[PDB]
Amino acid sequence: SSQLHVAIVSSPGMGHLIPVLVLGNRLATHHNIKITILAITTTSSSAETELTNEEKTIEIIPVPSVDISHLINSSTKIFTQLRLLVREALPKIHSTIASMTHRPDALIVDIFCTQILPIAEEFNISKYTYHPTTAWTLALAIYCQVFDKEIEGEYVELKEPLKIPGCKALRPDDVVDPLLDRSDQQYEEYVKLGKEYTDFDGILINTWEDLEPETINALRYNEKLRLLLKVPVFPIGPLRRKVETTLNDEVIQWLDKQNNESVLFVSFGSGGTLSTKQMTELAWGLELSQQKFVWVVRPPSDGDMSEYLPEGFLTRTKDMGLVVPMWANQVEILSHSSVGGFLTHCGWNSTVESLTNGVPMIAWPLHAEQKMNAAMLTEELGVAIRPAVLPTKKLVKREEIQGMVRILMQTKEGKRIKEKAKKLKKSAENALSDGGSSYNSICELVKDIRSRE
C-alpha cells in the first residue's frame, strides 16, 4: 500500500544496465521502493534466456527489441541505431508495462529511451529521465535547439566557442559526437532528445551540486534556460557500483606488493580501443616512463597480446608493469590503496569510479561526451591532465606519453592533482551521506512521485 513501484528502463548493453542497476539500488536503500528494471535487449547466442529478489524488490525483466537491420547501414552512427531500436521497440515496451500485474507508479527512462514518453502518458505514470553524465552535457543537449537556429554552418568549424547561458563556454573541438556533422541522422536525433527532456516530470543527473554548482544553478534559474526546461533537476550523484569480492583477482594480488598510490591504471574498458600505431606508442611511453602500471588491452582497430605490442614488450616490462587482456575489475582496482593514477577515456562512470576513490587521471577522450568530460576534469576541476591535442585529432607519441606518466606519478604537480582528487572524493562522500545534497535530492524526487499519486 505505502510502498512505491518505480520502473527503470535501460537501453541495451552492460554499459547501460549497470548504471540503471546502480540507480535502483540507491532508490531502494533509503525509501521502501520496489524497483523493476525493463532491460531492452537485442539478439545474441543461446543467451536468449530473455538480482531478481526473494521478497520481489529488485526484478530485472528483459524486453526483447525488434530487429532494425532494415533501417540502418554499415555507416549509421551508434546514436542513430540506439534511437531507431528504441523507436521500433516501443510497442513491445507498451506490451511489457501493460501486462505488468503491479503497474509502476513511476517510470524512469535512461537517456536513450526518452521516446517511451507517450507510453507513460497513456498509462498515466509519472515520467523521469536519468541523465548519467555531467549536468554540463545535459545543458548542452537542452539548449542545442537554440544553437540549431542561430548557427548556419557546421559547429566543428566555428572560430569562437558556444555560449550556454550560465555555463562554461564549450570550445568547438570538445563537442559531443552527434554535433560533429550536421548532415548526419544523429545530429537531428540529438536535437530531438534535447527537446524531449523538458516533457518529463523531472531530470535526474548523475552529478552533485558541489561539482557543478554553476551549471546546476543555470539549469534552475537562468532566464534563457528556464524558457526551455520548466521542470526540476535532481543531481543525485556520484552513483556507482560498490566493491565486490571476486575469485582470484590476478591484478589485485599483484597490487598488494606495490607501494601506496604508486601504480598507473590504464584502461579504456569496453568503451573503445586504440589503433595499432597509437597502441604501440602507448606501449613505449609506458615502458619509457620507468613507471609501475597495470594496462588493460583490446586488440587494435585501424579505422595474443604480444603480436600487437612492440616486440618483447612484456619480457622487458616484466619487473615493472602488468598487462591484462580484455577486461578487469575496474571498481576494485581503482579502490586499491596502491593505485595512484588512471588513464581513461573519461566515460562518466569510469570518471566517477576514479573520483570517488581520489585517484587522479590522464584524460584520454574517445567519443560520446568524453571530450567535454575531459575538459571539466582538467580546466574546470584540475583532477587530470590530457594530451596537448585531443588524441582523436592527432596521434599521441611516446615522448609525450612518457612525460604525462612521469608528471602524474612522480612530480609534485602529480601530488597536487591527486590532492584535488582526494578533495573531490570527500565532497562526493558528503553529498551521498545522510543529509547530503544528493541524498536530499533523492528524497526530493520521492516527494515529487508521492505528490502526483
Numbering used by the authors: 3 to 52, 59 to 311, 327 to 476
What did the authors write?
To gain insight into the mechanism of NbUGT72AY1 catalysis, SI and UDPG glucohydrolase activity, we determined the crystal structure of the monomeric protein (apo) and complexes revealing the structural alterations induced by different ligands such as scopoletin (acceptor), UDP (product), UDP-2-deoxy-2-fluoro-D-glucose (UDP2FG, donor substitute), β-carotene (effector), retinol (effector) and combinations thereof. In addition to the apo-form (I), a protein structure was obtained, which crystallized in β-carotene-containing solution (II), differed from the apo-form, and lacked the electron density for the ligand. Asn372, Ser373, Glu376, Arg249, Ala351, and Trp350 frame their donor binding sites and in both structures, the indole ring of Trp350 points in the direction towards the uracil structure of UDP2FG and UDP, resulting in a π-stacking interaction. All other complexes that vary in their bound ligands have one (III, VI, VII, VIII, and IX) or two (I and II) disordered sequence parts (shown as red sticks in Fig. 2) located between Ile42-Leu59 and Ser309-Asp327. Upon substrate binding, the disordered Ile42-Leu59 sequence part in the apo-protein transforms into helix H2, which aligns parallel to helix H1 above the catalytic site. Starting with the apo-enzyme (I), two different conformational changes can occur after substrate binding depending on whether the acceptor (I → III) or donor (I → VII) is the first to interact with the protein. Thus, as the crystal structures indicate, random binding of substrates to the apo-enzyme is possible, but the products are formed only after ordered sequential binding of the substrates.
